[PDB]
A = this chain, B = another copy of it.
């Protein structure tokens, strides 16, 4: 009621988080205008 507290700076408590993956390997990115996607992997073995 008459304490008259004084506030100092409070902490922030950050989170240790660095992707390395959404910045290293996944450089490419695309949208989907369709319901699904297709992936092609054609092996080449000539005789």
Contact = CB atoms under 8 A, between A and B. Distances in A.
B38 A8 contact: yes
A4 B34 contact: yes
Contacts of A37: 5-8
Contacts of A9: 39-40
Number of copies: 2
Interface in A1-17: 2-15
A32 interface: yes
A3 B38 CA distance: 10
A6 B36 CA distance: 7
Contacts of A8: 30, 37-39
Interface of A: 2-15, 30, 32-46
